[PDB]
Design a binder for this molecule. Structure first.
Ligand SMILES: Nc1nc2c(ncn2[C@H]2C[C@H](O)[C@@H](COP(=O)(O)OP(=O)(O)OP(=O)(O)O)O2)c(=O)[nH]1
Ligand SMILES: Nc1nc2c(ncn2[C@H]2C[C@H](O)[C@@H](COP(=O)(O)OP(=O)(O)OP(=O)(O)O)O2)c(=O)[nH]1
Ligand SMILES: Nc1ncnc2c1ncn2[C@@H]1O[C@H](COP(=O)(O)OP(=O)(O)OP(=O)(O)O)[C@@H](O)[C@H]1O
Ligand SMILES: [Mg+2]
Ligand SMILES: [Mg+2]
Ligand SMILES: [Zn+2]
Lengths: 552, 648
């Protein structure tokens, strides 16, 4: 409705009918035209843009960043460090069509908590004059606060100096939450996606910054208002937290209390046998670079078939969703069950072949793009973008991305077309695991022949919640139990209308997580912080992954 | 087939990152980025839509025959206003809610400088022009004293006294005095003054660094911002001015020039101009920065058309009757149904009128008296069409929902705090001004009849008559359509080199009329003709009074005069002697893509620090500042390569 918002749809409605006939081959055109394959984010097809990336902020903060004609200096304070983090999330958004996230936010804001107070003792000293050159190289327990009830001594300056950074850190983090919640900079939707990760830092500086993050979030933004960004993620690796005899167990009790109030902080299971790495040293500082860090878009980039297994600076190239619900309708006329399942696999075989080539054609289109089109994404943020001339091509470093073959309505696929769905049916549970394994096995075959990184993704319900259903419903009238819901259920998720307990959902949805390596989420909808620990307790027994709790 | 055989090659040209296919119309945009490409696709769709579905046939025939040009035709269906002024007082003392966020009133200087950047960024996405902030020094003054109250209460808890008497302590100045060689309370009270000097310096540092950075990016319309200051006498007020000057004079990043914001210094006699005046010392410093960073600009408050009769020194300088200038050269000072103030108001629309083609049409007649009578007859008819065109565009912008302009129609527009989101903005839109422009007056008919005005001859009488004829006619339309028309010297960025090519095709290469390509800027002496600064001032001075809708006295000063602060002062005195209102000094700087260093040399190829060969030219265009000569238009690059400098 805004002048900037209405300008974007003029370009979209112009460039969307253009790409259909002048960029696609005849076979993919018919498959796309016949409502079989969906191309996510087709508006930016000519621009040759990528999906997302995990922001490395340690490099940006230590040297600043110069995008366009705007330049900045390295941060030397808590206020300067937090504010520059927001800008790094604002410039890159205009160069992509997805979202941003901060991996291990705790580690980044920790030297400057000390450094803002390290030189503060030199300003609190000149009033007195005594050479107090010992307030930095000492083991601080928690950067604690006191009621200031008649403190007295020479070392009263030592307690006053540390008292100066706790208030300043609290003020510093208020800027970060407000900046990412009120600055409308993106074209169109006018909101920049963001996400941060914290919960696995135990140092004195890290414990202070993590507490204030929870303390500031407990208060809100402006006047007692829950923030929408950034999305909060909590780590629960065993041996650092989640155990009573742990250094960070005290904050974990507070974190569940904050979650009970604002419902913002999500949890990530670092013990899943696929969210697990062999290079986690307990003593090496900055425990990131070998951990799992997700986003708000259920995007998971962990294992690379050519490179290193990490989630830093990587992301998706582009992903397409395959309508498997439609294929079952065409095979509903076969009387013999063995023949019926034979046809569905044959029909699924043809669509999968086109989609692998369909993603391959868009990949070839994107590799010709120049690095000058992404001033910040292809300069500091991407994996191998530190050496890329503006006039070069992205074909060298574009391979460290994920092409996603997603699906929708697995429950809708089997609810009435083939018997029952994967809820109150053990036979359908075996059938459902067979199909996803069939897609997973084919994606392995596509990876060998097309030489890419194909993964099965649980596509978030955003932009494709009702598009598929309406088009197919008209073609096939009213199919009872399938095309009478106006929305297809999300990937490998128990349908909402099927009543079940949290324990039962954990058991049913656990096996799918090892299959959908491209992204998954566990959703629990429902005061006491303990009940939050119940979710991670059941997530502990069964190998699951990313988890979230909502109220609505 | 041509409707789908050349429209396909247009999109391909955009996709392949070409250099000439209308992708270099605007220098503030980066067309090689995904954000830039989407804007190009949308602009190339609506402009054909406007021609055959929006404007009438009489105006259309002028457009296709290259008679009347419209400005910002891309945003025509969006119903977007041009510019506005920002009363920062409302947002810094009560708080504001933008989108799903909110805020509370600022308590120190760090949380007050950051709220000003938010309003400028937010309001840009609702208009297609610039943004301005008047009385900048006055608005930030109270919170420096509020910073003094918080630090005292902080000292009270750490000490335990009753320092209520220090809440309104009459201290002489906020200048920092180091605590060396003193004892007792000199290390207990002087500290509270040296503490807050560094606090104010950082806040002004953040404000500047949050205005150039946002302009370097952006998926929406690029951010165009400006501020005004100069006439504050309070101790807190002088503190704001002295920090903003030092912050600007220091620079963004690695000591590089800030493209934005635009800064203007306000000159008045008896407040800052005379040596006896209090702010004379800061007055001298402003000339030091504008010679080195091309800011602040100088606006004369003593001009006859800039004087105000509701200004009293007993009040705190009454920062409401001081004229302020928005981005480029737009000014909104007079009003027939409102106060003579430039607070929370701006421009609506403006169009340029082609006059060179009218005279070359009549060049076949050998009777001088006959030509002029027919020339006036054509001009009267053409001006009638343009007055309709601005009014016709005016009728389109009236019916815009206030919810389409959230920040503009809630805090920043005059009397806009009384309208609900679903209401129409027509009840308060009339405070804007409609501009009628012209181009190539020097080569309109004077360069056809002998020589143009300003060529050391007496031909200015005819040139003055033509502009005055429009000036009288502009007033006639004001009394006719019940609007407020004002003639403005139209900037030449994209329209420089558009009319000329069609006339050459239709008529041919004729010296004076054509073969000059870019054409001379409105009311200005031929940029290819030599003149002194004083003589150029004398010829163009009477035009400033005739164009009460925007004007600028541009002086091209060589690099050697940058180091001398007297040349800027002489120009201001030269502006004072005559009735010139707005003037600026331009100069060519050189940028570096690695270090970012700028120097004042005539031409640079390798950066002294790094050694890179990507040394671009940092120069000024008719309305703003930008580098990256790879974004200088073909018509404008011709005008740039023929500019004449004035040593004085
Ligand atoms: N968007 C944005 N908001 C900021 C920034 N820094 C501070 N704020 C917000 C936080 C609050 O909503 C507001 C005022 O913060 P203050 O620390 O001055 O506190 P205030 O005096 O409102 O409340 P208090 O007396 O401390 O309870 O400014 C920033 O960099 N960006
Ligand atoms: N765009 C933008 N830049 C900011 C903002 N706040 C601060 N900056 C810039 C100002 C500086 O370029 C940088 C912070 O500089 P510091 O305060 O760390 O000091 P600097 O490195 O200049 O050294 P110094 O303290 O002068 O010795 O970040 C903001 O809100 N937006
Ligand atoms: N990025 C920008 N965002 C907002 N306003 C801008 C921007 N760039 C320029 N402007 C405004 O637009 C004005 C340009 O008017 P000008 O007379 O130079 O137009 P032009 O180059 O002939 O073309 P047109 O009016 O078609 O864009 C500038 O003086 C300034 O006020
Ligand atoms: Mg506070
Ligand atoms: Mg500093
Ligand atoms: Zn250099």
């Amino acid at each position: 409705d805004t002048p900037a918002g209405m300008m974007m749809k003029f370009a979209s409605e112009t460039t969307k009918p253009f790409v259909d006939d002048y960029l696609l081959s005849e076979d993919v055109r018919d498959a796309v035209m016949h409502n079989y394959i969906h191309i996510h984010d087709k508006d930016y097809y000519p621009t040759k843009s990528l999906t997302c990336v995990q922001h490395p902020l340690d490099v940006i903060l230590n040297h600043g960043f110069t995008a366009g004609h705007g330049s900045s200096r390295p941060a030397k304070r808590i206020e300067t460090a937090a504010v520059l983090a927001c800008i790094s999330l604002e410039t890159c958004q205009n160069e992509m069509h997805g979202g941003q996230a901060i991996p291990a936010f705790d580690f980044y804001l920790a030297p400057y908590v000390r450094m803002s107070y390290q030189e503060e003792v030199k300003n609190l000293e000149k009033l007195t004059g005594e050479d107090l050159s010992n307030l930095y190289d000492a083991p601080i327990d928690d950067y604690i606060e006191k009621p200031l009830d008649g403190l007295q001594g020479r070392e009263r300056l030592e307690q006053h100096a540390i008292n100066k950074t706790v208030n300043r850190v609290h003020q510093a983090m208020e800027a970060f939450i407000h900046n990412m919640n009120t600055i409308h900079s993106r074209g169109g939707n006018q909101v920049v996606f963001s996400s941060i990760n914290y919960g696995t830092d135990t140092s004195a500086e890290g414990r202070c910054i993590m507490r204030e993050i929870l303390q500031s979030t407990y208060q809100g933004v402006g006047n007692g208002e829950t923030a929408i960004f950034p999305i909060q993620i909590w780590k629960k690796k065993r041996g650092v937290n989640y155990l009573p005899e742990d250094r960070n167990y005290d904050l974990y009790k507070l974190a569940c209390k904050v979650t009970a109030r604002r419902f913002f902080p999500n949890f990530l299971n670092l013990d899943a046998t696929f969210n697990q790495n062999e290079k986690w040293r307990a003593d090496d500082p900055e425990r990131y670079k070998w951990e799992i860090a997700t986003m708000g878009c259920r995007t998971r980039v962990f294992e690379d078939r050519w490179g290193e297994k990490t989630s830093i600076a990587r992301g998706n190239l582009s992903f397409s969703t395959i309508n498997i619900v439609k294929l079952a309708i065409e095979c509903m006329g076969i009387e013999n069950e063995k023949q019926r399942i034979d046809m569905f696999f044959a029909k699924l075989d043809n669509i999968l072949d086109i989609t692998a080539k369909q993603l391959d054609e868009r990949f070839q289109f994107q590799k010709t793009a120049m690095a000058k089109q992404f001033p910040l994404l292809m300069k500091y943020l991407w994996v191998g973008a530190e050496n890329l001339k503006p006039e070069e091509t992205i074909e060298s470093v574009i391979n460290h991305g994920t092409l996603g073959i997603g699906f929708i309505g697995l429950a809708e696929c089997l609810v009435a077309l083939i018997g029952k769905h994967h809820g109150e049916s053990e036979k359908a549970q075996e059938l459902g695991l067979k199909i996803i394994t069939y897609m997973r096995d084919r994606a392995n075959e596509f990876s060998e022949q097309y030489h890419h990184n194909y993964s099965i993704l649980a596509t978030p319900a955003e932009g494709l919640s009702g598009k598929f259903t309406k088009k197919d419903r008209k073609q096939f009238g009213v199919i009872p139990g399938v095309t009478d819901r106006d929305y297809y259920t999300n990937s490998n998720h128990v349908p909402v209308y099927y009543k079940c307990t949290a324990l039962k959902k954990a058991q049913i949805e656990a096996p799918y997580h090892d299959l959908t390596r491209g992204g998954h989420i566990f959703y629990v909808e429902i005061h006491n912080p303990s009940v939050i620990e119940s979710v991670v307790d059941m997530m502990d027994k069964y190998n699951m992954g990313y988890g979230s709790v909502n109220h609505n």
